[PDB]
A paper describes a structure:
We then studied the interactions of ACE2 with monomeric receptor binding domain (RBD) from Omicron and WT strains. Monomeric human ACE2 bound to immobilized Omicron RBD (KD=38.9 ± 10.5 nM) with approximately 2-fold higher affinity than WT RBD (KD=75.5 ± 2.1 nM). We do see local differences at the ACE2-RBD interface; the Omicron RBD forms extra interactions with ACE2, including interactions from RBD mutations S477N, Q493R, Q496S, Q498R, and N501Y to ACE2. In particular, the side chain of S477N forms two extra hydrogen bonds with S19 of ACE2; the Q498R mutation forms two additional hydrogen bonds with Q42 and D38 from ACE2; and the N501Y mutation forms extensive packing interactions with ACE2 residues Y41 and K353. These additional interactions may compensate for the loss of polar interactions between WT RBD and ACE2 caused by RBD mutations K417N and E484A, consistent with the enhanced affinity of the Omicron RBD with ACE2. In the ACE2 binding site, compensating mutations strengthen RBD binding to ACE2. The enhanced interaction of Omicron spike and RBD proteins with human ACE2 is consistent with previously published data, and may contribute to the increased infectivity of the Omicron variant.
Author numbering:
A (entry chain D): 19 to 613
B (entry chain A): 328 to 525
The structure:
Amino acid sequence: STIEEQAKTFLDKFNHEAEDLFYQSSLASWNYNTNITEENVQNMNNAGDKWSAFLKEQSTLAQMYPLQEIQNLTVKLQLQALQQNGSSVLSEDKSKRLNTILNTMSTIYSTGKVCNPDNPQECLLLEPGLNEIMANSLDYNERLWAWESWRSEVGKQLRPLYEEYVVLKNEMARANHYEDYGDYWRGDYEVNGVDGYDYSRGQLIEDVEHTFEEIKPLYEHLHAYVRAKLMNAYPSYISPIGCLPAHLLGDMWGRFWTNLYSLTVPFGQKPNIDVTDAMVDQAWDAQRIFKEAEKFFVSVGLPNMTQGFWENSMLTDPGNVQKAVCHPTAWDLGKGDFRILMCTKVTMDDFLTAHHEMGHIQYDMAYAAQPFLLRNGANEGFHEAVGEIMSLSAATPKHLKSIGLLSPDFQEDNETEINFLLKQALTIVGTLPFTYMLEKWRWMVFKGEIPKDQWMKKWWEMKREIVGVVEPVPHDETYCDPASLFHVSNDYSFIRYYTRTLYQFQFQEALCQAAKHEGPLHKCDISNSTEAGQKLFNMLRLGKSEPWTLALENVVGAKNMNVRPLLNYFEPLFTWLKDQNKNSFVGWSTDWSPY
Amino acid sequence: NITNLCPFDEVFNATRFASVYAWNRKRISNCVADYSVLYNLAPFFTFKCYGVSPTKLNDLCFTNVYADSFVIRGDEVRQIAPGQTGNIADYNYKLPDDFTGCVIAWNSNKLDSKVSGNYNYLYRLFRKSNLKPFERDISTEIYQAGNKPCNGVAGFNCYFPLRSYSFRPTYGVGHQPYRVVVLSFELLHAPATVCGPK
Ligand SMILES: *[C@@H]1O[C@H](CO)[C@@H](O)[C@H](O)[C@H]1NC(C)=O
Ligand SMILES: *[C@@H]1O[C@H](CO)[C@@H](O)[C@H](O)[C@H]1NC(C)=O
Ligand SMILES: *[C@@H]1O[C@H](CO)[C@@H](O)[C@H](O)[C@H]1NC(C)=O
Ligand SMILES: [Cl-]
Ligand SMILES: [Zn+2]
């Protein structure tokens, strides 16, 4: 028989045994995350070890099918997913050395704590307390201490570890026939093989930098508005022409600007839309929130939730006897098992989180008829972009009075949509220059374009130039300011947060045309529209089997990542921001430093 | 006056169903065939007759009746039909294309699913050629997927042909077990023994 027909036969054997061993791992992972027990730890660790021992053996067996005499692109896609060596191309003493720096980094990050210089008995961890100083404090020197001491204690311990981490990850990727480790991360977008839908790994860098040039008119008007409003909370500390100090942006790293809404609100006397107080008067519970979420998905023609959804999911915090990990998660266990783990309070944010995690289940339910290695998103940004356009329609005042949570005699004016859209751009637009330069710094560290004696020199030369954020203190090369973030210490690709944000409004504007919506894009509700649900489902059904450039064309009609739907969304905000920044300098000077 | 009923209670209301590769055939002859056991319909929902009418079952009289019983998944019940292609239809149980008879299927999840997995139900995954209609292949010979003769052992490009089902109750429908009975009506130019009630 031919070597391709021996590969179809090998994958038929694999798909039967991978689907059995992945269910046992996922069911043991579910039982721990709902019932934290040492026996539930050993069930989770043993079922996940059998699945990793199986996937290691089948990776070795898949390498005997050369991937050169195989012409079906469907068979070729799941062999190369299984032929991925990873760290097995390295030597065995360096494969344990690379795993040593990776486990030490998460240990220094999670168990690193900072003690205040007033009392030595009290110290502060990051996630409680030091996140509360960076979010809610309005004193300059109080959050200047919490910003600097997190980077002068925990970022100092990660500097000699990160220089060894880059070298071994580059040895791993060069042995896997890439250029560097940043080239291996860009391989999630490589679509070599299909005519008319090709995409190279270097093409991602050029397409990210091209879309970012159009965000800068919208972003530097948001930067000029936030800076003019932060001159009232911290006077004699902000320059009218300078950058923003890094410890005043609402969190530890300046990743999101969402905690700046108390100071940058346009019309502060008008309250936001919050149907949390309207929920308790109608006596909503966690079941009502989630049945109104799956009512929304059948209105666009997607399926309702399965019988085993309502029998096996955890939709409520089970009390202080049953201890569960209370993070909202959608679970695709395989073999028709779809569960959502969530500890749902009767709030507006849990009502939109219910539409988020159900948008993940509806996408897991759609590609269930694929082979096992093709059951994922089209790329890494596709899956979170689908869950984000469901919360986008559900939070509209159109949708919120069609289910009866707003009053029928409710009038929305222009002094509330600016309050809505600016709160969005603090979260959505305010994270895109952070996401773009943190990957552009990492892509050049792996490429060797930044030598290790100039890491924090070009980290702050790019933070001034791209984000418009200045350092409050000088930093030499003993600091490692990127690795103070979770995703840099824990070895995660970060450009998926950039591409998801552009896919989200590309997805939303396409389903908005199909629903035939009247006016502004931020008022779009795709509910009661089966043409918007059928255009989405033709992408959701493919999973990982087609090009992501082809799956993007099944909804949007274009083959590439596009930023014009994002700028169309914030168009009433951009008009109001350009009128407000008339007496102020729009832009920053990278020469100004606050020290 | 009624006569001896046909033993369908030891077919449908059994406790042991077969694997689909080793399906159990039962010959039914010389009795009155009461097809009004359809009143079990609330678990017994699937009922599809080919080549004969469902209501005109007692209108016709037959020589022999073959009942074939096994367990498949929920997503493979569509393969128990004339002119179908799949894993079950090609290597496990093939219906004729001119098939006269009925296919009865029902969900068996609260009877054939274990929390640790029901690994007792098997199916043939690999075979050198498609099955003939009503052929039963029960061999456990090592399938040769490549060009080496495989030496009677399972290794690279040499697979064991039979795989299991591993039924668990938290599966979705389509992976939950379904008990299937296939009734096959013969006319062998003989004294037609199997008749409906008059
Ligand atoms: C590739 O393989 C799949 C399943 O093995 C098959 O359905 C398809 O026809 C093959 N060819 C192409 C061009 O996709
Ligand atoms: C989905 O299931 C719910 C729960 O019974 C039901 O009310 C609804 O009508 C179903 N929708 C469809 C389209 O089957
Ligand atoms: C769909 O339309 C019906 C009837 O007009 C309405 O009651 C319901 O609220 C709508 N659902 C939405 C907008 O989600
Ligand atoms: Cl930083
Ligand atoms: Zn999500």
